[PDB]
Design an enzyme around this catalytic site. Structure first.
Site, PDB file in Angstrom:
ATOM      1  N   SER A   1       0.856  -1.208   0.000  1.00 13.12           N
ATOM      2  CA  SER A   1       0.000   0.000   0.000  1.00 13.12           C
ATOM      3  C   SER A   1       0.880   1.241   0.000  1.00 13.12           C
ATOM      4  O   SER A   1       1.671   1.415  -0.942  1.00 13.12           O
ATOM      5  CB  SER A   1      -1.015  -0.053   1.146  1.00 13.12           C
ATOM      6  OG  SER A   1      -1.644  -1.304   1.219  1.00 13.12           O
TER       7      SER A   1
ATOM      8  N   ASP B   1      -8.098  -2.605  -7.041  1.00 17.92           N
ATOM      9  CA  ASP B   1      -7.682  -2.391  -5.662  1.00 17.92           C
ATOM     10  C   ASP B   1      -8.720  -1.581  -4.882  1.00 17.92           C
ATOM     11  O   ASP B   1      -9.204  -0.545  -5.354  1.00 17.92           O
ATOM     12  CB  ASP B   1      -6.329  -1.685  -5.648  1.00 17.92           C
ATOM     13  CG  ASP B   1      -5.668  -1.738  -4.295  1.00 17.92           C
ATOM     14  OD1 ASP B   1      -4.847  -2.642  -4.061  1.00 17.92           O
ATOM     15  OD2 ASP B   1      -5.989  -0.869  -3.451  1.00 17.92           O
TER      16      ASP B   1
ATOM     17  N   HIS C   1      -6.939  -5.941  -1.382  1.00 21.95           N
ATOM     18  CA  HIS C   1      -5.993  -4.912  -0.944  1.00 21.95           C
ATOM     19  C   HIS C   1      -4.814  -5.567  -0.232  1.00 21.95           C
ATOM     20  O   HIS C   1      -5.013  -6.222   0.791  1.00 21.95           O
ATOM     21  CB  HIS C   1      -6.703  -3.918  -0.012  1.00 21.95           C
ATOM     22  CG  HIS C   1      -5.863  -2.743   0.369  1.00 21.95           C
ATOM     23  ND1 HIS C   1      -5.503  -2.474   1.672  1.00 21.95           N
ATOM     24  CD2 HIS C   1      -5.321  -1.758  -0.384  1.00 21.95           C
ATOM     25  CE1 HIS C   1      -4.768  -1.376   1.707  1.00 21.95           C
ATOM     26  NE2 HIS C   1      -4.647  -0.918   0.474  1.00 21.95           N
TER      27      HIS C   1
HETATM   28  N1  LIG Z   1      -2.593   4.622   1.164  1.00 24.27           N
HETATM   29  C1  LIG Z   1      -1.818   4.602   0.341  1.00 24.27           C
HETATM   30  N2  LIG Z   1      -0.832   4.577  -0.721  1.00 24.27           N
HETATM   31  C2  LIG Z   1      -0.969   5.503  -1.826  1.00 24.27           C
HETATM   32  N3  LIG Z   1      -2.026   6.270  -2.069  1.00 24.27           N
HETATM   33  C3  LIG Z   1      -1.769   7.000  -3.202  1.00 24.27           C
HETATM   34  C4  LIG Z   1      -2.506   7.962  -3.943  1.00 24.27           C
HETATM   35  C5  LIG Z   1      -1.950   8.537  -5.081  1.00 24.27           C
HETATM   36  C6  LIG Z   1      -0.669   8.165  -5.506  1.00 24.27           C
HETATM   37  C7  LIG Z   1       0.059   7.220  -4.790  1.00 24.27           C
HETATM   38  C8  LIG Z   1      -0.513   6.640  -3.626  1.00 24.27           C
HETATM   39  N4  LIG Z   1      -0.040   5.717  -2.745  1.00 24.27           N
END
Ligand SMILES: N#CNc1nc2ccccc2[nH]1
Ligand SMILES: *[C@@H]1O[C@H](CO)[C@@H](O)[C@H](O)[C@H]1NC(C)=O
EC number: 3.1.1.98
Length: 342
Positions: free
Chosen positions: A145, A243, A288
């Protein structure tokens, strides 16, 4: 069990000024090192970080961390749970910086919180060299994540760090799980969140990507399909096509035509961004994370499990007959793959 070590450099801290740390289980007969980055969203201004400190404090502070953790999935030492790397040296790096592992800013008279994710990774690597890492053949930087995005942001900096310290023989590689997001239209009305966060955190991105997008546009480098082509270290990308975090930020929760088309288009777009990623594993499931889940051995694409695909990747870095590395589902709807998590 993995044992907690708080960082000896106490200037490298979690959000609230408490020292960061890492959990370690050594395998003295092995030259393979696995460093795993925990995930768990982020916060991007004073009020929403204050809310996170009230009810998600272990992601902002080491004050209540336990002295041990059990290694699960790819961090497990039993061959039955971890066919891939069961004999490796195992490190779990807790996520206590709320900055998608990008920050380099201390708590001070102007800053209520410290955002030091990028510096935490560098300090963990430095202190581990004195515990065995100086003898490694491969350092695999993995994460789920927010930690998967953290791999993309930091793998080349770890490689440059070890080269400058005189270790050109350690091969640094990355494994990014559930960190490959799209900057797409919401279903009902991330880029702005990341844009806010970078300024609040003093966030840092990889050098070549920064030179392409330039000042004010560094948020582009948090999106895998934009930053991946700029990286030099080998990176294996694990990504569910549907996801749950992607659907959440897209404001998707008896499916009618409009939503059916939205979901089908999201899967096709994700598959397109992976077409030229040679080491990847992307099943058609709504889920996820995977790599530190106990049952990570169960899911398969085109008949090949994820531990097998990663083993085939290792062999390719020495095409392989019956041992593939690029595995992307083509079927267009969640759980059209029968091996999806139930
Ligand atoms: N929670 C979590 N990880 C996450 N959320 C994102 C939203 C936009 C770009 C990269 C990202 N990585
Ligand atoms: C501690 O970490 C800070 C921030 O990364 C660094 O500037 C400093 O040199 C480190 N100190 C020691 C003694 O390693």
């Amino acid at each position: 069990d993995l044992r907690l070590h708080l960082l000896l450099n106490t200037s490298v801290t979690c959000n609230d000024g408490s020292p960061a740390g890492y959990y370690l289980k050594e395998s003295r007969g092995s030259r393979r090192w696995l460093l795993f980055l925990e995930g768990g969203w982020y916060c991007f201004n004073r009020e929403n970080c204050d809310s996170r400190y009230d009810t998600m404090r272990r992601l902002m502070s080491s004050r209540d961390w336990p002295r041990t953790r059990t290694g699960t999935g790819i961090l497990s030492s039993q061959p039955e749970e971890n066919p891939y790397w069961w004999n490796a040296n195992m490190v779990f790096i807790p996520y206590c910086s709320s900055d998608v592992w990008s920050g380099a800013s201390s708590k001070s008279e102007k800053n209520e919180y410290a955002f030091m994710g990028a510096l935490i990774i560098q300090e963990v690597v430095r202190e581990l060299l004195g515990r065995g890492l100086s003898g490694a053949k491969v350092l695999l930087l993995a994460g789920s994540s927010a930690g998967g995005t953290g791999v993309l942001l930091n793998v080349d900096r770890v490689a440059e760090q070890l080269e400058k310290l005189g270790y050109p023989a350690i091969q640094v590689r990355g494994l990014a799980d559930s960190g490959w997001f799209l900057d797409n239209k919401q279903y009902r009305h991330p880029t702005e969140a990341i844009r806010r966060g970078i300024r609040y955190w003093n966030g840092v991105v990889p050098e070549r990507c920064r030179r392409q997008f330039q000042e004010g546009e560094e948020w582009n480098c948090f999106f895998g399909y934009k930053v991946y082509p700029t990286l030099r270290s080998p990176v294996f990308v694990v990504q569910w096509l549907f996801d749950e975090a992607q659907l959440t930020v897209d404001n998707v929760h008896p499916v009618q035509e409009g939503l059916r088309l939205y979901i089908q288009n999201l899967g096709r777009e994700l598959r397109h961004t992976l077409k030229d990623v040679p080491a990847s594993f992307a099943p058609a499931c709504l889920s996820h994370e995977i790599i530190i889940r106990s049952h990570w051995t169960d899911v398969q694409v085109k008949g090949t499990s994820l531990p097998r695909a990663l083993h085939c990747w290792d062999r390719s870095l020495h095409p392989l007959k019956g041992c593939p590395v690029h595995l992307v589902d083509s079927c267009p709807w969640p759980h059209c793959n029968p091996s999806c998590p139930t």
